[PDB]
Symmetry: D2
Subunit: 488 residues, 4 copies
């Protein structure tokens, strides 16, 4: 496909308006445009992006374009796209987009595959990823081509509708496999052909980084990678403060009830859980925390929160928010013990945290649409119901518009810097000898730079060290100011 696939081009005007307003606070991206718009450090680069296509993301895409790159983009979640944002990008020819709000799981993988396809067929030079789906289709595509040549037929794991243990494959796996199968019939050298020109990936979130580290250990990582999620100016701000506002927005839109005085269980008290808890407390809720890490559990106590095992609180709590990045944290057996009209939502990257499949396929269960992406499930034996927000997917992006511009600018300034780093290192990626790669992070020098670029947004005034002071604490006047192990 050389032209874009979006919902409505006429929404472009509203998108450009929001983009300009958003830029007031996205000073990091505005500075990169101002500074590098003439020198074009990314000239000639082909960038494919798999990341929530929001207004904030449009400014990221615009920044990459102003720096000389050609762009192809898709969203990393079926409900997160903002149609007016997508329209703005195609209206100005900044990028070729394959994204719309409320995609089917089938269309999600077709869009991702389209975004990965470039014309003279070849692939991208760089990848901006959030969740690891773009990275996954690449690696699984290479595996599928190896297995295809070995037996000279379509591999049986792609045609079966079951996994290795007899259980149904997830819809995401079936739809991806379906795309990989269609591509083996067109060209069985497609994916391995892309490797010649791939110079790296920037990964945005915790869950995607986990998938990258697993590949690194096993020696299966096929391109350089930069962990953007673990920059201080991303994990300590986006993950925490972003969700503090973003979760509330999502709950206010999907849940009609008052949060004050309710017992709200936050499962997981990591970077995201901490923020969720702050916001919920901020509007009068009584947060109960669930956690497996004894250090994180103690942190929750120190902030005045009760720490319990879900089993002891499931019958009495009013709302459940999963923020673990784990699997089967809320089971169907848990949901049956919940009380009438208990709300369930997820803010971790995938829909595995809540057993949504088990709930939808429960024998004789009744489901009704309460509103746009909010469903009420009623069990036949007890006659009790539970309300699920946007089928267990990211509520902050599914029921609302995700994090606001200021924090996304910090996350995206890191992305641009990561893309520039990977591109500037092209020459060192020699595949005639080195087919195996590692995950690295951006330096603390750049991490502090990202923070400096956003100080004027909030009228912050930094103090400057004197020569003597700098020497006393043993740091340079211009930084960095802390050790690599410092936790902020």
């Amino acid at each position: 496909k050389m032209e874009s696939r979006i919902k409505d081009i006429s929404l472009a005007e509203f998108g450009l308006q929001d983009m300009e307003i958003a830029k007031t606070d996205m000073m990091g991206l505005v500075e990169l445009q101002r500074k590098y718009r003439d020198s074009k450090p990314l000239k000639g680069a082909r960038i494919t992006g798999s990341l929530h296509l929001t207004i904030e993301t449009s400014v990221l895409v615009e920044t990459l374009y102003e720096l000389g790159a050609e762009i192809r983009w898709c969203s990393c979640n079926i409900y997160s796209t903002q149609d007016h944002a997508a329209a703005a990008l195609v209206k100005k020819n900044i990028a070729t987009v394959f994204a719309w709000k409320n995609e089917t799981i089938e269309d999600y993988w077709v869009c991702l595959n389209d975004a990965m396809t470039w014309r003279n067929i070849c692939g991208p030079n760089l990848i901006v990823d959030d969740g690891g789906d773009a990275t996954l289709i690449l690696h699984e595509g290479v595996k599928a081509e190896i297995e295809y040549e070995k037996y000279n037929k379509i591999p049986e794991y792609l045609e079966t509708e079951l996994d290795e243990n007899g259980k149904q494959l997830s819809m995401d796996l079936k739809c991806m496999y379906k795309v990989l199968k269609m591509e083996l019939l067109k060209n069985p050298f497609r994916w391995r052909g892309m490797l010649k020109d791939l110079y790296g990936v920037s990964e945005e979130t915790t869950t995607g980084v986990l998938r990258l580290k697993i590949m690194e250990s096993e020696g299966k990582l096929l391109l350089p990678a930069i962990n953007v999620n673990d920059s201080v100016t991303k994990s300590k701000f986006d993950n925490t403060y972003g969700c503090r506002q973003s979760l509330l927005h999502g709950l206010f839109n999907g849940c009609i009830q008052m949060l004050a005085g309710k017992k709200i269980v936050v499962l997981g008290y990591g970077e995201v859980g901490k923020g969720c808890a702050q916001g919920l407390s901020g509007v009068g809720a009584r947060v109960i925390v669930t956690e497996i890490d004894p250090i994180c559990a103690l942190q929750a106590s120190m902030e005045g929160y009760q720490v319990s095992v879900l089993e002891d609180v499931v019958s009495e709590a009013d709302i459940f928010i999963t923020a673990t990045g784990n699997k089967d944290v809320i089971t169907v057996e848990h949901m049956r013990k919940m009380k009438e009209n208990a709300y369930i939502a997820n803010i971790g990257h995938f829909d595995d945290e809540i057993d949504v499949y088990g709930l939808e396929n429960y024998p004789g269960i009744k489901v009704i649409e309460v509103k746009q992406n909010v469903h009420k499930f009623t069990f036949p034996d007890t006659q009790k119901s539970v309300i699920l927000l946007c089928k267990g997917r990211l509520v902050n992006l599914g029921c609302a518009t995700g994090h606001p511009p200021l924090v996304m600018s910090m996350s995206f300034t890191n992305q641009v810097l990561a893309q520039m780093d990977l591109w500037k290192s092209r020459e060192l990626v020699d595949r005639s000898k080195n087919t195996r790669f590692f995950v690295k992070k951006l330096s603390k020098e750049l991490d502090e730079y990202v923070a400096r670029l956003h100080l004027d947004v909030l009228g912050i005034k930094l103090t400057k060290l004197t020569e003597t002071q700098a020497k006393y604490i043993n740091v340079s006047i211009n930084g960095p100011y802390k050790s690599e192990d410092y936790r902020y």
Copy 2:
């Protein structure tokens, strides 16, 4: 009009779903239905309501209906109606509704007038008014009193009064759109029947007023001896002012800002003008998500309260150029002027949470010479001045942002406010016989008792799993109160 005027009847199904979910937390109204649905304490009563037609309001209307009343309803703001809620009411024949989201100011007054019009049960042909009124902001009460004034002035000179035909006030300034459109309706009614409004007085037994601003208008009429019917101040029940006004807004304001303002609130300087019941709640919510609240206030006691909560207290002039967002919660007039807005910084957001659009000089802004306006989104406008080229974003034309850009307060707290409403309506209706107009031309404003105020609270304890302690005989005697209450003096401030 004997049939309803709404946006879309097919949205009724979604409305009934939200109503059932909302009822999980609205235990006060659910209890009143359970208790009085058989005895019908309001049987035969004709109730007209002028109050934001939200899902929460649908449950209020349903409660009044289950208690035997016939209902006619309209919204008290052009942007607050939830079309699916309105559809649910007409779908089940609970009430006759005249309301839709995004009404014109002209249609607002026509809807209110329609809601006030009833067909005479004796002679299905003639016109009469309601027996009771549920009001929020005082507009239903205003059209009644101004209608009576207009009829007095009509008979005196035997012609349409000149104050209704002019488009200017007593000083040469343009009348507000709300006054022109109301006057236009009063004029049309003088041509149909010049005894319409005074005719309604025979059967009017009272009004329940929901908000601070409407109560102010009632107290002014009481002092001047111009109040034409009994009134109950629902806003000053402890279970309304200390919960709805404060905790309702804590959530409700944030919802409105999140929907209308795309920016992050954390670290921003947000000015909350007015630190009363509403301002206090607004400040709590804003702080809750990391904002730096600056407070403006005229009351030295309220100003000190703000300091004790860690907030800076300043005059708007000293903070207008640096602050990022402005929230008016004063119940006053011209708190944000055009001269203030010109000194604001690029893309500063302005919003109002007090009952009317007077707090911000919206008329002055829209009519500023050579100003450019553009719609950022549904009910959000960006105004750009021609000389400085700087812009300000206004949320829903300076009207209630919590109801204009969002869905207002959540069910739990509205159930507390509405349980008071039902009790007020039952009180006014039960006192009918004492309202003798052949002699008593003087009416007053009263409040519900503390006994009932505590009752409202008891009805909602199970929603949040609250467990009350019960006094022993000795304890009750020691603190000099009954085991069953009331537990505090009338002057207690909670």
Copy 3:
């Protein structure tokens, strides 16, 4: 007793230093001194005070002195006196003081009686009483009323009444130490002069009551027609109840706990019994340092307020075995019983912040069969039950922890409370002539006006750099108030 009784006069220098520092924030008292030191509105008045003798109280006493009054003072609690503050007053001859930290209950009543005793200015040999009383808790008011009762009963049978000699109450139970020691003083005074107390009535013009508990005792006397002098309820001024009671305790409780309890508050389950003016503040402070507050309450309205602030509301029975710390703020009796304390866990801390030691059954605990007690530190005792071998730590024998283990509320907020006191004393004194005892005559309890309540707040705005906004003529008219106030209705709850 011409001369004072205090612990150590050499501590006077430190007291005068703290007084000057405290005055930086006590702008209300500093303004009254500046304004009235020349005109002496209280010249010739004899004032007896029964109120915690802290540095803050020294500035109150100094203010009354600069306004022309002669002063005699005692503390209203055996642990609250700050010896350096008492020394400062006697060093400068501002007042005659009878107070020291760690008084015995016996000495407490002797000090109060001494403070009530004055030398007749006409005939130096004879005795008389005060003209005005500054009271906190109602003990000065109590000894007066019980003294009059004792004299009536003395003349009736011409002998010492038997209720004063017995060590038991009407049901066989031991009298409280406070009753025994007061009775012992009243008995001595009947032997010196059986017309002493009734003689004081001739010149008594009123009492200013500082706290909730004392006001309750005044209202009971008012109903029964037993109140023998005019009274002003200072506690219910907005600038007292909404600041002192709430914000004072937010800091003051923490100070007390940090000094008496060695443990960390963060993450602990702390039960606050009573969520009134004081409880609300206690909860804010505790949350502020990471505690998990659980609330007990009998009032459904107050219970709901606690929920809205994110606190769990439970009955003590359901949380007594698991909670770590217990804080009583009810103004009630037997809220923590010995049966409750036996179910508590090892080294659970128990403290009280309500005015008297009745909230916790301290007598029952100290007299429990075979119980072992040990002093952990200055005014902190650990009690160990013999059967379970478990222990509970009690802070300063169940008396005011904020004043017993720490120094009470800080200057800023006490200045607001004490500015009301001075204004109350001036009011009572200026009304002398209207107090005619040759006639019926029932006395009542009244409050200060809102005009004065706002005045108190204005006097403290500069302390925190608060900038008030001023209403325009139009704005004042729109909201129907004077530009200079008052700004709210009498029923407004702030």
Copy 4:
């Protein structure tokens, strides 16, 4: 030989507080229960330089129950709790040299005494400790400076001139701490010029408790001057994220409430430094209604403060209007005399960073014609002669939480001290690998994440925390062991 303390009769009150404190110090209670029989530290001589509080008494008791002989001194002239010191000497747990309100001269004599041990083989001779528990780096400093002084003594065969002078290399007066330390080093060169180097033979390591002391250790490591192995206890997650932050949240307030008579609500309080400590200080101050203004040099920390609703300014722009100033930088000359002269009447100034350098106290006390008066125990009001304005300083610019109050509470100190005991056990168990016949560089290391999580587990029951346990599938999905560790080494919590 025998201890030096204020009053032995206060011992009974100390033992009472120790037992109460142990209810929450479950980490130390568990170590005692577990290792009291096997005595993993048997035969070890431990010298400690750390605030002698009730909490510290439980640490000392734990080390004793594990078989060590102990000598102890405080690491600050105002932090000692006399009843705690008395308790240790009453039960013969340790030999103590500490009392509240020491003179700077006596502080260094106490530290030197604590470092002195009687040779077990030949009772006549002197030796040093095997292990050192340090907080601030003073025990580590006297050792290194003592070795330097002995090298310079033999070279020139005379007392080095830098020890006799009362001035530094630029003509400025030496700090009292340097003069008094030098005075002790000089006296020891006259008794025995091989004393300090003699201790090196048996030194197996030091556990450093605080940020500032770690900085001093890292400087020595870079320069190749570190003379013994070291463990950075301060950077364990169960120390920096709890003690530094949550400890101060309560501890600062306690100090201010005791030293400052004023109400904190509504006041503009400047917290200089928004690091681990600053964050906690700000939380507590906000908790009681103050309006916190933050000062910071780090753009990342500055942004963190904004996100919590705090204004971030340079001191110059807020010094005339702010009411209270709290230094938490670990830096030098953050509050100067020129700053204090611009402050308003009765502005309060306090420090919570480890040393008194953050505030120019020397400059203030020695200002021409200044008047000083004692407001109370360790609180002084200084009045400038030209403007007539005054500033109140809390405990001469030293740790206000420990100077005006009792420091952090037991729960968090148990977490910090459980790390200490584990560090001491680690250093002692590695003795054999410390071979000085080969002159190797010594480095600073940290405890493992396995142990860091262990410390947290030991304190879960104190607050009734209930941990969830991962299933086999879950553990595999997130790629961790069911028993941990649960996070990567770079994770910031």
